[PDB]
Structure formats: C-alpha cells, structure tokens
Amino acid sequence: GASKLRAVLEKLKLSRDDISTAAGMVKGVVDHLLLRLKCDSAFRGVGLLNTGSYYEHVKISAPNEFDVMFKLEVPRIQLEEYSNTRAYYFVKFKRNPKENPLSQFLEGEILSASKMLSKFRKIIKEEINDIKDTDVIMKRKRGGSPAVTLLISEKISVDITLALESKSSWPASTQEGLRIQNWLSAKVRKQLRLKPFYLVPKHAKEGNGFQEETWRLSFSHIEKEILNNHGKSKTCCENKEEKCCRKDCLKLMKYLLEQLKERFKDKKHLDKFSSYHVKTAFFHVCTQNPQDSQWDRKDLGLCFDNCVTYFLQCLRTEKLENYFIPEFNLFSSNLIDKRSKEFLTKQIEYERNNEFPVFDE
Template identity: 45%
Template sequence: MSGRGKKVDEAPGERPGAKAPGSGRRKSLAKAEEQSRGSADVEAPAEAKKKPEQKKKAEEKKNADNKARRGAQPRDTRPPASSEPLCAFNDQPCTAKSAEGKKVPRSPPKKGNSMDDDPARILQDTLEKLKIRKNQKSEATKCVNDIQDAINKHVKASLGWCKRIQVLKTGSHYENVKICECDEFDVMLAVSVERVDIQPFGEDGAFYSVAMKRHQKHPLDRFLNEDKTIRASEMLKEFRDKVKEAAAKLPYVTVDRKKQGCPAVTLQVKKDDLLISLDFVLGLEVHSSSWPPFTVDGFKIDNWLSKKVKTDLKRKPYYLVSKYEGRGTREQNGVIAKDAWRISFSHVEKEILKNHGHSKTCCETRPCCRKQCLKLLKYLVQRLKEKYPKEAAKLCSYHAKTTLLHACANRVEDSEWAADQLSHCFQLLLHDFEEHLRKQQLPNFFVPSHNLLKSAGIDKKSCNLLADYIEYERNNSFPLFR
C-alpha cells in the first residue's frame, strides 16, 4: 500500500485520485488573472504618466499632417538676388525657379483667368482712369480761350504783320484724345502767304526755306533776305516779345524760357485749381495749288476715307512753323537752319480724327475703338517715359498718333475696329508700334521720307529696348496699367 503513495483528501462524490473536469484550466486562468492584476497594479502609475505625453505627441503629429495637407508654404530656397542676373522688366531673377521653390497655393485655383489678368478688363478700367471730368474740361477750355483772346488781341495791335493773323487750335484736346488731365493746349497763330517759293532744307522733306516771289508790297518784306527768303528767327523773336508783353498783364500766367529749336512760346497757367501749359506757335498759312513733292507718296487714305476726302483735304492750305533741328547756324544754299520752317499737317490730322470712319456713319450706329486705342497707346508712352526715362526720353505722343494713322490706313474697315474688339485691336496696334521700333523706322504719315524716330534722335539700342518693354507689357496683361 505504501508504494501507491500518500492518501489525499478528495471531494465528495469524486473518484479517488480523479481531477474535476476543467479544474486545471480554471486554475491556469485564475493564476493568469491574478498575475495580470498584480502586473497592472505595479505598472499603472507609469502608464498613467505616459498616456498624456503620447496623446500630446499624437495630436502634434496630426496637426502637422493636416497643415502639410492644407498646403503649408515651404522655406524659400531661391538663391539671393545677387547670385543671378535680374530681369529688366520686373527686377526678378531671370533663371527659372525649381519646382521646390514655387509657392504652393492654399486653395485650388479657380477656373478661368483672374480678373486681375484679364486684358480686356484691364484696358476698360484704364480707359475709365483716363477720362477727363467734364467740369474740369469746361473750366480749362474757358481759361485758355480767355488767355488766347488776350494774346491775340495784343499781338494784332502791336505787330503790323500780324493784323491778319489766323488762329488754328490743334493738338489732342481739340482732337478729343486728351488723357488724364486738361493740362496742355496748342494754339497756332499763322500769317497767310501766297505766291511763295518753297524749297527743301535738308533731305527728308520735313523742313523748308520760304521765299517771296515777285509780288506787291507785303507786311513780311522787312524780314526778307536779299534772295527774298524769310528770316523765321527774326519773326519768331518779335512774336515772342509781344506774347510775353501780353502775358505780363495776366496775373496767373508766366512765360517759360526759350528752348533751342522750339517753335512755341510756352505759358504756364496757375489759376485756382488749374495747372495748364499753353503753347503759342508762330506759323505760315501757305496757299498753294499743291502740297510739296515729298508728300506725293504719303497721306494714303484713299481706301480708308476715300479719294474724294483726300482731294478735298489737299486743296486746303498747309502750314509751316518756325522750327529747326540741330545747330541753328548750319547753312544750306545760303539759308541758315534757324530761318527754316517745318511743315505741319496738324489741321488735317484734326479733321481725320474727327471723321475717322470708312463709312460716314462710323460711331453713330456702331462705335469703333480707334480713339480708345490711341488714348491707351499715348498712356503707355507716358508710363514708359516714367518707368524708363533714359530709353524713352525722346519718345512722344506724336509717335503714337502716327502709328495709329498708319494702322487705320492699313486696316480700313470699321468692323476691324469694333468697340467690342478693343483688346484685339490694341494688341495689333502695339505690334505695329513694336515693328516700327525694331526697324527704327516710323515714317511721317504725310512725308514718308521723314523718319520720326531718327529725327527725334532715338538710337537703335533704345528702340530695341522700348520694343522689348512693349512686348513684355502686351504679353503680361499690361503691368504698367495696374
């Protein structure tokens, strides 16, 4: 019996030595549970400390991920401005930026162009800015008319040769293409002459000497040389003196100093809120059966305004103003430069811009954008002169007007200048202007042999730079207009 082992207590109803079903498993589970409770009791304080820290780190990671998904801007990795050349247009590096250097938009881009980059909208907004208030225009016009009457009256009374002087109002104000402010006016006071001999002074047909033919006594006889040519410089001196005398009686008017080669006597008007520059120009009104030979290949309006209009306009007198280029002492055929006269067709330009349509009803039934395009081009010239004073110093609004006249003669139909096609028409006009600059060739509309760009002294380098600036403007929705 002893070899079978010790007797153990057994549960009632159980066989001796037999284990209750599942007792081993229950013991294992109980032991595991006890160990688990004990382990939890030991580790609970440490876990309690770790959870807030882990939660905080998780929140930070989540916020960082969300920020990245929303498009947080990366650090600017572009090189310093000094490490690479700058673009002439916007002072930014000319080299392309890498993809990593670009800013990521905070929200998806909207479909279509932004209103800020819509050329048509920009041009319309610019035209609104260029409009002149009606009351300002009215006040300025009245002021100028009063001054003109005073000057004209004094000059006629003081100079015998000015008794029959004619007043010709020219320039952008009277052509209705003035922009921004009513601050500039041009008035020509012209002496009528007949039976004169007009000879070119120079090779481009823009300047002339004027000699009296055999005639009866004329008020200008006192200004004649032995060869009967008129001494323009002496006429201009007397004229200037009398304008200064008349201006001295007007308390709000001063006279600018004379500029070499300038035909105008310039008055500065400061009256109330008005600041006006008023040019009085001495001229000759030439009555002749024809315009000078240099004009034969110019004034090409046959297909635009009609041959009849061209014939009618050429029957009118043309004008010569006392102006010369270069040194006034330069001599040609016995005539010195300061006694030369420059041909002017400002009266014809005024008539053309007033009646500018291929059809007589242009702008009555359907408006065109010819004048709007000219205003925009004049404004661009003004902004270029402000932005690039060195290259654009000698550029002027007359270059813009001449470009438009050539464009109208080439694109004659009114439908090609429809008002709702302003953006397209202006782009074409700018392209024309670019081509003239790149070729350094802008012919006078009336005298094709007269190159306005070279005559103004704009060199080839400046022409190319100006063309580049204009190309940049039209390809980038006109930054100078904004």
C-alpha cells in the same frame, strides 16, 4: 483682358472736368494774346487755327500740356527745300507785287524763321505781364522748337506755335503721303489735299546746332478732320449699329506712353517720345486695317494689340514715317537717339507680352 482696357478707359473719363477747365484757362490767355498780336503791323492777319478734336482752339498733348497754333496768312509764297530733308523748307516769295507786311524778316530772298519767331516771342512776353487776372510765365527752350511755352497758375502749360498759312498745292514730298485711299477713299484724299497747309519755324538739326532759317511742314489741322470722320462708312459711330473702337485705341495708346513716361521719369530715357509719335503710328494702323469691321467695339483688346505691335515694330526698326511725308523718318538717329528707341522697345515689348501691367489698379 480687354476688360482691363475698358476699365482704363472708364477711369480716363473721370478727369475730363480737369482737362476742360484747364483748357478754358488756356482759351482765355490765348484770346488776350490774339488781341495784341493783331495790333502789330507784322501779325495783324493772325488768328487761331482750329486744331482740337474736342476743344476748338486747344489741342491736348499731355495731362497738363496744351498745344495752340496761331496762323498767319502769307500769300504768294514759294518753297525751296533744305537739303532733301523733305520736311524742312526755306520760304521765299514769288515777286514784288506790292511790298508785303513781313518784309522786316527777310534776308535776301529768304524769310528768316528765327527772326520772325523772335518778334513773336517779344510780343507775347510783353503781354504776359499785363493782365494780372491770372499768373502766367514763359519757359526756356527756344531751341529747334516752334513753340513758345507759357505756364498758367504754375500748373497748366500751353505751347504756342506760329504757322504760316499757304493755300498752294501741297509740296511734292507729300505726293505719296496721306495714304487713306483704301480706307477713307481717294475722293476724301483729294478734298483734304485741297485744304491749306502750314509751315512752323522748327529748325533742322545741322551738326550739333540748328539751321534756324528753316520751316517745317505742318498738317496738325488735318487730325480733327479724320479723327471725327474716321470710318469707311460715312455713318461710322453715328448710330447704334456702327460703333468702332478707333478712338479708344488712340486714347489707350496715348495713355500707355503717358504712364511709361511717368515711370521712367527717374532717368529720362523717354523724354523725346510724344503723343505725336503715337498718333502717327495709330493712323498708320488705320491704313493697314481699312474696314470698319476691323475695329469692332467687341474686339477692343485685339485692335489695341494691333496698334501696340505696329508701334513696337517701328521702335525696333527705328523707322516711323511721317504720315504726310513718307521719306521723313520721325525715328531717325538724327531726331531720337538709338539708346532711347531701344529702351522703349524693351518696355513696350514687356508690357504687351504681359497684358499691360502698367494698366493695373
């Protein structure tokens, strides 16, 4: 039962050495690139964004795949929303106080996402050869993705995303997002919405191409902020009396998708699904279940089934709201095709009705 799930979780622990030394390798490379990007006129204000819930600059998103975010302070920034997509925006500036560093990537009033992403790639690619200490190479895509992808010693992959940092009020499309009021308090929502926010150069799907001057709102850095301060009680998991299973349910949810994605590797039906989809549904279940008593460590198997059922429902209805932007459907037909969503529903349906045989040893 939940005995199986506690055992899954015990075995996940055993591979923390591998992820930790992998993440140190990523940390090295990342620091070297940060040194050089700072040499450039355009990126001298660049720095690493603290996003990871265990490792500072390195978020883990797959067994051998890491996510790192470089942030760039871009002051006096004005947002024009692309075609009511809610998540995708054109970036302009307020005036010409004094000509800014980034003016090389302007096109009229608009800052091109692809033009700035392109000089980002060039600087990384030139630095990727020089330090022979470790063999790292670049990988393909560059299509409707903000990520520049390195492969380190042929095993470890790291996605590097440029992120404009805006200190302004969050845009209106997030007005009704981050619905933590009943869980973490209205006071905590007010403070989190005072933190900055980010724009990453992911490009909207237009027709069968991309609109590659659009940026996408990013709130990745809020995750650590809630994962590690996750209870209704400020002292949740700080003493032996308040031990919940919120973190273990998220760990189990990610592992479930990882295993399923590994098993349907033959015909790639599940390519488009990622741990981001699982985190989003998880935090939506923390919203439905706001009391620390709804996540007692003794109830692990039922809290897990709460998470799998909500995820299942999102797949069946083809609707998973962006946690920060409610009108942005992570599961729209535009983003994931209808056959894939159907495919995962059948598999997660099956796993759940059979007490997760994918977890068997």
